[PDB]
Write a protein that binds this DNA or RNA. Sequence first.
DNA 1: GCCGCCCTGGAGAATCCCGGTGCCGAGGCCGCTCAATTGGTCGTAGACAGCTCTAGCAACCGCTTAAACGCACGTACGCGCTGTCCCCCGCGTTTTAACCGCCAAGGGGATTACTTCCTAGTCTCCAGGCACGTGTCAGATATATACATCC
Lengths: 263, 88
Amino acid sequence: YLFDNAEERVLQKFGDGKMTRENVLRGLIMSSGKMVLLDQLLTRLKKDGHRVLIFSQMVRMLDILGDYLSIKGINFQRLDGTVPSAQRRISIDHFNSPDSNDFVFLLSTRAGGLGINLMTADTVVIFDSDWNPQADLQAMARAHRIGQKNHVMVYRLVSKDTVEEEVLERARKKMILEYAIISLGVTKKNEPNAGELSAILKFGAGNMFTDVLNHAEDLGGEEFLKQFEVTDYKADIDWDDIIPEEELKKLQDEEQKRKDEEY
Amino acid sequence: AKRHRKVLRDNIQGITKPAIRRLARRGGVKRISGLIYEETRGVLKVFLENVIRDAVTYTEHAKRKTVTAMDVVYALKRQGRTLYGFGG
DNA sequence: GCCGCCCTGGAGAATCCCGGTGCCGAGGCCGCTCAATTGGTCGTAGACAGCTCTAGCAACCGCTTAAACGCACGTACGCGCTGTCCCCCGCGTTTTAACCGCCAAGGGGATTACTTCCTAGTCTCCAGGCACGTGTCAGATATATACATCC
């Protein structure tokens, strides 16, 4: 849907072009392979007691997610470069209030600086990866601040066999470089340094691309070998599975009552 | 409906009313009527597409996708409007 | 006798001027380096001469006739004045996006050098298309002569 005149083809080829308030959400979910995983994650995190930030590199994709949560009916708040600083302060204070009904808070990844406090959220969904891994690290550190009362869980959404593979490969190489120079020069191991630098350079010369949505987790060199694994997700969800009988009854009653009240 | 199209169509409206007023002030015009601006935008669009079509023809002759300044200079020169300051 | 108030003098600090020294713009100098110069050779473009035929030119003629010119009249239109109303201009206030400074990677395109081969220039020979002139032929046009008819 980021391309112009692409929603019309999906609507006229699947929902036969009527666009009657239910097939639009189906087209939004089933047009992209990230959106089915995003919908399953959103339902699972709404089922639990979690709040989620969602980071994107494009503000048009933020518009797409905002429309998805508008037709979906989820109290969301948003922040990008178009929002001025007063409404930014209002939105950040509204999300961090103890009586907040907001569930998901959308960001453009490079906006807001380093001074955004996102204390109350727990899950961070990196929808689009950055070329610079420090931008994604700051995005994760928006919620992973000092004094956080919950185990922060980060889900990175990757399109399989696409151009995002080399985006993650370049990000992994830059993290390897930062762990090499910066992390090993902070503030009998000199003999094992000649082995473990060779090990991390063999990691840097290797391609990373050869109970799944659990919000839980049960020496320092092996810690860096984590969070580079790839967990392949298969949906196999057809057109009529989404919008179940609870959601379809709520969507049809709201559409029927809208014609009675006109407006 | 936050989603919309990336493309823009009212780029002729980027030639604003005070820009046309400034161009008329350089032309020595004291008073301007309100229907001048749409006519000026149409005239500018016609002139711009006349120059740009010839420049694009000069570009595709060289098997290029980049419109250089020299192609614009040649396109203006062929129709009888020689422009200095870019040909060197 | 003791304490408080008014008048006047010399020493400490701020500012202007000058000299020594370091930095920006421009010009002299040096080094590469490729294109202008010099020298020689040769082919041909053009100057020159000559003959023939047609157009132009100065100054005059004569005839025709249609265009130009002069004049009178009249009336339509250019122009000036006045009203009116409406729309553009000036100004104050609020918004907003241009502008400048930033990633982030990748492709387009300008050069430098190199290789290769296809295609266009050049040369020779030849033939047919183009330019010019003419015999001939079918369509168009005008009248000669015979038949029906009105007065």
